[model samples]
Target: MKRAVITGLGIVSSIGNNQQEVLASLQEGRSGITFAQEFKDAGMRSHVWGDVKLQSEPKDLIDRKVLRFMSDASIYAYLAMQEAIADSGLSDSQVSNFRSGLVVGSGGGSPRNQVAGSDAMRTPRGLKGVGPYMVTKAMASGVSACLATPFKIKGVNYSISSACATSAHCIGHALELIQLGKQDIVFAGGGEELCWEMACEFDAMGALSTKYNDTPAKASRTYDQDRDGFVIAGGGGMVVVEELEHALARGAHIYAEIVGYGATSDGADMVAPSGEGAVRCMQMAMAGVDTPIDYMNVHGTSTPVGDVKELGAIREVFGNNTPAISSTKAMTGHSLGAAGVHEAIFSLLMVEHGFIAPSINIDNLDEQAQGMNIITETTQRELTTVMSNSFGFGGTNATLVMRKYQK
Candidate 1:
């Protein structure tokens, strides 16, 4: 049997643009969410957003021809992939082989670009406003497709989109690809663009923070009694998952082992969450984990019922064996599909670095979450196994389990 290990990671988030920057923000207590004047001007009840500011404009590094087809989400993925490939020390030839693969996705491929292209096509210029790149640029699978060509990767090139479970699903599919001996290595994750369309949609659904727009950094009050809704954010996360034996042979830097992935659906409401699926999902991920999970990163997206229901599910699954719990969403907001992979990176980093990043902005942890050991401040703890949970609308659930890699 082939074992899969995470050899490298890259991330771009509201909190930070890369791994080091994000780690610093996580450890040092900094938040990337802030008030967006546009939201307020647009008459949205929720006026805050988790906006990602890359160090440089995309055009500065990406070629004009490439930029024509790439959306902000795709661009973010490209940057993250660059860092992940670099961090993995994989050469162009290495990724150019048939043994390499990629699986990445987004909530909806670049809504901003799609909107612009559509709006332009309605003008007098009509079809001239549209280009050959329109279809790919606006596709939900565009991130993976755009990524594969530029990175010279071949084999199993595809994308997954299950709302917020998108990235975790992609990672899980990548794991299967390696275990099935179809590929030696795969890059897996997701990206989202923090744009007006995302905000308008979520706001229209009344699923965003509104009261704390003036104090945006504190708007993402996950698990808090006063929590209203999630703060929409965007970015990307990609990790290099390589076959264990191949990694050892290549002398790769092992971050953590990707051991188990679980997926389930509530089969209930499109918006409501159920504990049954969450419990089963967590259990499935923990099935292959011999040791107790040392920590857990929950999908506490600050929705009133959603946060409480997640805790209820945890209580059902863990009983008394509760893992030290925290929600990075309070800092990063809910990056939707991208949240899974970003929080996964946060989990593996905790396992590798020996500390739990606090789930900030909790003045009052909800009474329903009482039994859960919510970490409000950074704490040092040795960890072996860790779990990250993500639940999306439509009752889609995904759980990823990672353990400290040891020879």
Candidate 2:
């Protein structure tokens, strides 16, 4: 069986737009969560967010003519893809000529884009207000469509959505395709565009932090005893996964070897996660693996119940041998579908650099999360194997186990 390896990584998060900036932020223990004026103006209970501060406009990253047909989420994905391709040292002609494919994971359509067209129905303009580009900009697969054409990929190019686990599934499915000899290369990840409706909906569900509007940086307190809920955020993350031999033949730099992937459904609740399901998912990923995990990136969303349940699951799976665990969400907030890929990128980086990013804002650790080797400060440690977990709403869970590449 051919192994799947990560050759490139691209990210656009609240903390940074690229690897160097992100690594620096991680090392410095910087927090990107900030007060969202728009959320406050919209009367949202949760006014804090981890918003991407793009240095340049989408027109600067992509052609202005193409920008018209792309939504904010799609634009972010395209920009991330460009970086991934360049980081992989793959030329335009090489990408266009290879058996390449694209897979994008998203929560759904851009709420703002959808609302722009929805308003037309109540007015006299009706369908006229819905421009020809509306569909391309508002669809769930908009990011995938916008990405495929530029790369000239004729292989499997589509979008998948499993809420927070969306991008993890995208990368996992692509790994399967490569292992099955269906494709040589796959660009897979997810992006999110923050919308007022997203915040409003989560607020209505009583799933947002409402106490830290003044202290945005401390709003997302993952694993903290005083944690309330996750902050809504937006960003993009993508990686280039290629077959091992194919990558080596082309002299591609392998960041990490994709070893195991596990996914499961809780079949329990739409919003609540089951500890049993999470434990099973992790066990499935670690099955037959004797290599001790050096680090773990968790789906620690800072929600009271969610954090407790995740720690319980981790304890059940790893017991006394728990690896150093940290939630990057405390710094990046929760980017929903994009978060899975974002954390995956961090996991690989941790293994590559022999350091663990800190889980900031843990003033008082939660009782439920006690006894865990949670890193509150950035620490340098040699690592070989690492795991990243992404569990989304609707009881969807995905786990990825990655290891430092060895010849």
Candidate 3:
């Protein structure tokens, strides 16, 4: 199989927007989660969210003509895709080349737009209130189309949606395509748009943290004994994955080598996580490599049941040989489909920087999460290989094993 390597990264999250900012925030243990008045106004039980900071005006980054048709999630993907492509140092011709492709993941349009369209049908504006672009903007493949149209990418292009594990699946599938010699380069990852409609729905399903609405920074307590649930957030993350030979031939800077990708589904449940599935997923990812992982960026959503199940899976597979595990969700909250891509980028950064990002708000590690070496503080370490895991609501699990690029 052809080797796949990551040449570029892009991110837009509550913690930071770019690689440098995200690395700094990770090292400094900064938390971007906070109380959002929108949730309170929506009468949600949880008002806390990890919204991406609009540090610069969106108008400056997006074309005015395209902005009108984009949903918030599409806009997020567009910005991240732009950053990733720029970071990759691909020439204009290479970017629009047929050998290049895109695989973006998103949960369709924004919840806000969905609610607005529904309300329009029931209100005085009637169907007329619905915008002409609603169908294009709200589709699950909207982000993929948004990017492919502008970049003139002519190769295989599609969107993947495995619930919260969406982007992990996207990246994994993209890697497969490159390994199969079907494409030389692929842009993969996802974005999510936060809105009260989804937030309240998650709240009603009892999947969101309601205990620390005022203390938003302390709300997402992953692996903590008193952890309640994940915080709702919105953002985007993308990676430029290229065939190893293609990247080296073009003198592209390689960040990390993707060695293994494993995906599995639990046929039993739709909402609850399956330890068996997670274990198999991780094992499958590690099966392709012989080196032990130095660290793990886990899918620790700060939920009571979900966290425990994931930890159990980790323990079952690695036993006492567990790597230093940490969860970035404590800071960025849970950005649904985008979380996997965000965590994957962070894991690569950890290997490149030789440091482990801390999992904050763990005032007391849960007894279930004990016996594993969980990183509670940002510390320098000699990291070469790492694993990033993402488990979705449909019992879908994806794991990626990445190692420091070495000649």
Decoy 2 TM-score against native: 0.98
Clash count, one per candidate: 0, 0, 0
Q: Model 1 off-target regions past 4 Å?
A: none
10 residues in a row with least lDDT, candidate 1: 61-70
Model 2 / residue 381 / CA error / Å: 0.9
Worst 10 residues of 2 by lDDT: 91-100
lDDT of 3 by residue, 260-286 (tens): 899999777789897999999999999
Model 1 lDDT per residue over 1-407, tens place:
78999998999999898999988888876788888888788778988888888888888978776677788788888888888999999888777889999999998788887888889888986777877798778888889888887777877888899888899888888888998999999999998888777679889988998889778898998898999999999999999999999999989999998888899999997886887899899989888678888899998899998888888899898774689998898888888868888999989888888999998888987887786778889999998999999888899999999998889
lDDT tens readout by residue for model 2, 222-277: 99989899998998989999999989999999999888888998889889798888
